[PDB]
Amino acid sequence: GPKFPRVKNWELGSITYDTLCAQSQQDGPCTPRRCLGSLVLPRPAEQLLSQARDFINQYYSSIKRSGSQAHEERLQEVEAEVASTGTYHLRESELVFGAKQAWRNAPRCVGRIQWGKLQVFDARDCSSAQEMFTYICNHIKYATNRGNLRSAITVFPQRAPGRGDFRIWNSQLVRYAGYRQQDGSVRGDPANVEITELCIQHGWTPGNGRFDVLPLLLQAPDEAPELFVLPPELVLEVPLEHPTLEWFAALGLRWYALPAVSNMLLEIGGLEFSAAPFSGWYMSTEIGTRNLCDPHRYNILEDVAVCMDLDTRTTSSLWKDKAAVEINLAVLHSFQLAKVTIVDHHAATVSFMKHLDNEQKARGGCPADWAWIVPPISGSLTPVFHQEMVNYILSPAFRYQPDPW
Amino acid sequence: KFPRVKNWELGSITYDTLCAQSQQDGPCTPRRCLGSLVLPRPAEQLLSQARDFINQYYSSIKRSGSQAHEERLQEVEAEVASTGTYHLRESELVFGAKQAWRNAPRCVGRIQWGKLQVFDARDCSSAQEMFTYICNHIKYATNRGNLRSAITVFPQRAPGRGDFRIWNSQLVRYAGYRQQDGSVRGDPANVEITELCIQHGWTPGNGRFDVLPLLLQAPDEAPELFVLPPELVLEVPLEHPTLEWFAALGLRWYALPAVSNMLLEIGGLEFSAAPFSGWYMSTEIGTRNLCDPHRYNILEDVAVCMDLDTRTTSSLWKDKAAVEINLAVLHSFQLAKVTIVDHHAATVSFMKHLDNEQKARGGCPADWAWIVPPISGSLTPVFHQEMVNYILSPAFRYQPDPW
Numbered sequence: 001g002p003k004f005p006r007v008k009n010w011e012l013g014s015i016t017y018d019t020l021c022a023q024s025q026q027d028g029p030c031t032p033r034r035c036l037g038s039l040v041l042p043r044p045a046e047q048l049l050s051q052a053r054d055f056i057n058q059y060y061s062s063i064k065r066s067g068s069q070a071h072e073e074r075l076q077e078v079e080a081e082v083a084s085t086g087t088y089h090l091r092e093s094e095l096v097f098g099a100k101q102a103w104r105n106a107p108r109c110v111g112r113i114q115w116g117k118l119q120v121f122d123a124r125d126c127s128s129a130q131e132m133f134t135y136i137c138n139h140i141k142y143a144t145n146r147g148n149l150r151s152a153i154t155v156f157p158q159r160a161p162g163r164g165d166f167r168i169w170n171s172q173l174v175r176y177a178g179y180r181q182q183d184g185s186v187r188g189d190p191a192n193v194e195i196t197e198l199c200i201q202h203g204w205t206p207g208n209g210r211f212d213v214l215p216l217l218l219q220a221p222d223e224a225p226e227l228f229v230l231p232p233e234l235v236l237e238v239p240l241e242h243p244t245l246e247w248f249a250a251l252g253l254r255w256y257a258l259p260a261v262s263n264m265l266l267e268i269g270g271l272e273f274s275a276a277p278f279s280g281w282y283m284s285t286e287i288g289t290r291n292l293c294d295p296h297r298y299n300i301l302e303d304v305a306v307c308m309d310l311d312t313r314t315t316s317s318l319w320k321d322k323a324a325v326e327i328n329l330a331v332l333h334s335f336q337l338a339k340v341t342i343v344d345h346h347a348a349t350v351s352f353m354k355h356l357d358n359e360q361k362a363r364g365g366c367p368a369d370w371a372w373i374v375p376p377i378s379g380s381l382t383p384v385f386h387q388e389m390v391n392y393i394l395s396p397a398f399r400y401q402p403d404p405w
Numbered sequence: 406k407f408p409r410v411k412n413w414e415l416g417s418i419t420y421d422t423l424c425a426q427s428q429q430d431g432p433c434t435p436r437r438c439l440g441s442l443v444l445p446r447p448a449e450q451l452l453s454q455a456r457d458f459i460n461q462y463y464s465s466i467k468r469s470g471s472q473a474h475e476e477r478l479q480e481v482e483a484e485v486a487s488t489g490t491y492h493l494r495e496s497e498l499v500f501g502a503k504q505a506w507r508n509a510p511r512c513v514g515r516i517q518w519g520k521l522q523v524f525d526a527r528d529c530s531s532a533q534e535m536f537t538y539i540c541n542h543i544k545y546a547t548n549r550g551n552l553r554s555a556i557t558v559f560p561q562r563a564p565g566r567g568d569f570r571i572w573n574s575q576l577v578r579y580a581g582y583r584q585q586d587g588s589v590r591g592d593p594a595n596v597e598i599t600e601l602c603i604q605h606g607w608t609p610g611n612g613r614f615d616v617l618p619l620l621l622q623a624p625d626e627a628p629e630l631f632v633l634p635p636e637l638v639l640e641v642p643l644e645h646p647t648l649e650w651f652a653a654l655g656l657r658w659y660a661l662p663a664v665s666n667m668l669l670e671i672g673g674l675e676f677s678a679a680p681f682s683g684w685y686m687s688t689e690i691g692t693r694n695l696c697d698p699h700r701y702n703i704l705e706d707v708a709v710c711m712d713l714d715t716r717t718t719s720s721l722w723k724d725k726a727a728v729e730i731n732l733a734v735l736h737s738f739q740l741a742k743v744t745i746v747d748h749h750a751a752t753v754s755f756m757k758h759l760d761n762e763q764k765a766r767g768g769c770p771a772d773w774a775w776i777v778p779p780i781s782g783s784l785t786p787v788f789h790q791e792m793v794n795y796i797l798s799p800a801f802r803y804q805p806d807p808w
């Protein structure tokens with residue numbers, strides 16, 4: 001082998017070299033002195049043009065037209081535009097290509113075997129917060145497809161010089177309210193306290209439940225954000241029940257069908273889309289393990305263990321483990337019952353192995369964040385645990401961005 | 406320069422300043438992270454690693470800058486200047502071994518770092534003598550079930566000649582025997598070492614749990630074969646709290662986790678045979694050893710016994726059976742009165758260790774993928790704790806198989 005990362009699968013004994021990483025144009029947070037790979041957050045003119053050039057090259061390569069008349073004219077067209085305005089504009093098919101490429105390039109998504117199937121909705125004509133609401137509601141209608149979920153992304157207008165951003169304030173399109181109490185405890189989802197408080201300040205009359213759907217705070221450039229309420233018929237939800245444990249349904253737990261991230265930046269060839277929400281379908285463990293068992297979230301492990309009649313007095317009864325399995329199973333069982341798309345952590349990780357194999361043949365590598373790809377239960381029971389991965393930033397990219405308040 | 410380390414369960418924040426004392430480079434660059442890779446791939450150098458360690462020593466017994474410090478530093482110059490190398494005093498080696506454990510980023514058990522019986526075997530000259538030493542280490546460390554962490558330090562490396570080595574990866578391992586049907590009986594990880602044993606003339610059992618012999622190598626000698634007296638090797642029959650059938654699986658594990666193939670570096674000196682042992686954390690046996698597909702791979706057998714649905718993965722039979730096997734192990738070890746710690750207790754103590762280290766040193770090098778357990782990851786507080794990883798010395802390094 002050569003001076004590219006050597007990558008081993010310890011279950012199978014198979015070796016690959018990552019040559020794609022050579023493509024990376026942006027430094028991550030690690031150095032030879034220290035690995036910072038487990039931090040969740042780390043941290044004009046020529047600079048723009050070069051990025052733009054790189055993306056157009058990428059576009060043209062993908063349509064197999066590298067070096068050609070139209071390829072070189074488009075380059076000259078992009079330069080022209082940046083020369084007289086300082087920015088430029090993607091073509092319809094260039095946006096489609098990029099959006100998909102950003103999903104392909106996201107090191108933290110286990111669901112990338114699906115990268116090539118993605119409805120790109122162009123909303124770069126959107127002009128008001130009201131119009132955003134509309135656009136967002138069409139997205140939710142399309143993507144939900146009555147439970148037969150379909151991956152999509154709606155792209156609003158790119159950042160402009162000295163001009164405000166289009167922003168969705170909500171971290172996801174569909175999230176539950178969290179209400180701070182007299183006790184100090186939270187009723188609802190403790191992640192969402194702040195945004196809940198922001199909505200009430202902007203005129204929302206709040207509910208008082210564990211599962212109230214948040215309204216949307218949407219922001220057209222240079223105005224303050226307007227508040228929009230999703231019609232309940234538009235938000236599909238799955239009441240939670242267990243297959244064998246009959247009491248589970250009595251807990252009154254539930255989750256929403258559509259996982260739609262809404263607070264991420266989509267950066268394509270230097271252009272920045274501050275508002276471009278995307279959505280797919282859940283992996284069982286996101287709801288069952290993270291949302292419902294995290295001590296700083298709904299934290300239902302104790303409750304369920306008690307119902308199950310486990311010894312919660314001692315760690316070694318593996319009461320946390322026993323309960324978490326049933327919650328997870330209750331998630332899957334119930335989504336399946338309601339005929340709403342879900343994938344379990346086994347099935348998912350199997351298919352990402354397949355994605356890894358594809359991307360090896362196609363690009364010679366696949367950036368991947370191990371701690372994020374490996375599921376929060378039953379880790380080494382899934383094939384990804386035994387797979388070494390290389391993490392690196394590629395572009396187009398989805399980039400986290402700070403809350404707008 | 407100083408990285409911010411947040412914990413997302415509680416929202417608390419620290420800064421790691423400890424990582425600045427790292428002198429040895431890891432595998433990451435700013436262009437790409439390789440932190441999930443299991444493996445990497447003259448007087449000035451040695452003399453400055455040695456001073457820096459002696460500094461670490463006198464500083465640790467508060468005598469930094471005193472007479473005994475100055476003259477010991479000079480004893481080091483003098484020895485390297487004349488011989489190309491030098492030797493450590495017993496107390497120094499004791500300090501360095503504990504520090505090597507402390508510095509081990511992949512060890513979730515570091516709360517215990519200061520409690521370590523150090524056996525000095527540097528006066529070892531034969532594979533015979535090696536064996537006795539190893540046999541004493543086992544008797545000490547096992548202590549009829551009341552496990553005591555220990556290390557034994559064989560003679561250092563030397564430019565003149567070959568290394569003292571223990572060919573085995575652990576002092577106690579189960580043999581893996583390749584069958585005709587291209588199948589493995591026993592432990593598939595130990596196929597190659599089992600074939601080495603047999604080649605150096607061992608008579609093999611044909612059970613699923615046959616304790617391998619030791620292959621011990623003195624400098625520039627053919628390794629020698631030594632059978633462990635069966636009474637030294639404490640084993641644990643596996644049974645289940647509620648499932649009476651489990652015991653009839655005939656499953657079992659050994660008490661003592663004792664790594665023997667890792668090189669111990671202190672002050673630039675290299676100890677190529679320095680086995681060490683503590684006690685197990687249950688997921689090691691229950692999850693990895695027994696349910697890994699390239700190991701004993703018993704998940705399906707056990708789930709079928711549990712009468713679950715193998716046909717589809719959304720019934721979570723892998724997870725369900727995985728838990729019972731971990732349960733069986735805990736129960737069994739607690740029943741046989743043998744130290745073991747579950748992943749919840751251990752990760753809780755690791756958090757506290759992170760706290761103590763923060764106050765004492767300004768951080769703790771940690772490797773997230775190894776600290777987080779292989780089941781119920783996010784169920785443990787380590788999952789939500791950011792972690793910085795970097796190499797401090799004294800350290801344990803991984804080493805090439807001697808063959």
Ligand code: HEM
Pocket residue numbers: 099102103106108109110111112114118151152153278279280281282283286290343348372398
């Ligand atoms: C198609 C079904 C999909 C599944 C099953 C899936 C699965 C996942 C999972 C389990 C995570 C870990 C997130 C967490 O625990 O917070 C993740 C992250 C991510 N996914 Fe997906 N994903 C899917 C589709 C998509 C789509 C359509 C996009 C956008 C085109 C996308 C882009 C991302 C990004 C950017 C992350 C990192 C998120 C962050 O850093 O906050 N994924 N995915």
Ligand code: HEM
Pocket residue numbers: 502505506509511512513514515517521554555556681682683684685686689746751775801803
């Ligand atoms: C006191 C009981 C101990 C517990 C519960 C414990 C726990 C663990 C665990 C779970 C691992 C990862 C194991 C794996 O999945 O391969 C590990 C790794 C390690 N531990 Fe410990 N440990 C203990 C004692 C020790 C001792 C006594 C030493 C030596 C002084 C030590 C030094 C190391 C080193 C160097 C590694 C890296 C493993 C490797 O690179 O293969 N630990 N520890």
Ligand SMILES: Cc1cc(N)nc(C[C@@H]2CNC[C@@H]2OCCNCC(F)(F)c2cccc(F)c2)c1
Pocket residue numbers: 040041111172259260261278279280281282283286400
């Ligand atoms: C603080 C911070 C930084 C960052 N980069 N990222 C986050 C999202 C956090 C991470 N962990 C939980 C939460 O993110 C919740 C959303 N995660 C992904 C998902 F569930 F919404 C999803 C699932 C399938 C498909 C899809 F398109 C989206 C937070």
Ligand SMILES: Cc1cc(N)nc(C[C@@H]2CNC[C@@H]2OCCNCC(F)(F)c2cccc(F)c2)c1
Pocket residue numbers: 443444514662663664681682683684685686689803
């Ligand atoms: C190839 C390779 C590289 C490397 N760095 N390391 C290895 C040891 C492997 C890793 N994964 C399992 C196996 O190592 C055997 C077990 N490792 C730790 C332990 F079990 F030995 C242990 C537990 C508690 C206390 C204690 F002292 C020791 C292999």
Ligand SMILES: C[C@H](O)[C@H](O)[C@H]1CNc2nc(N)[nH]c(=O)c2N1
Pocket residue numbers: 038039040371372373413788789790791792
């Ligand atoms: C500190 C650690 O990186 C953090 O808890 C991460 C670990 N892995 C994760 N993996 C996924 N998919 N989602 C997460 O939120 C996290 N949290």
Ligand SMILES: C[C@H](O)[C@H](O)[C@H]1CNc2nc(N)[nH]c(=O)c2N1
Pocket residue numbers: 010385386387388441442443774775776
């Ligand atoms: C490829 C991956 O890094 C490898 O499987 C690691 C992951 N985490 C681990 N963690 C521990 N404690 N022990 C291990 O052997 C491993 N294996």
Ligand SMILES: [Zn+2]
Pocket residue numbers: 030034035036037433437438439440
């Ligand atoms: Zn790294």
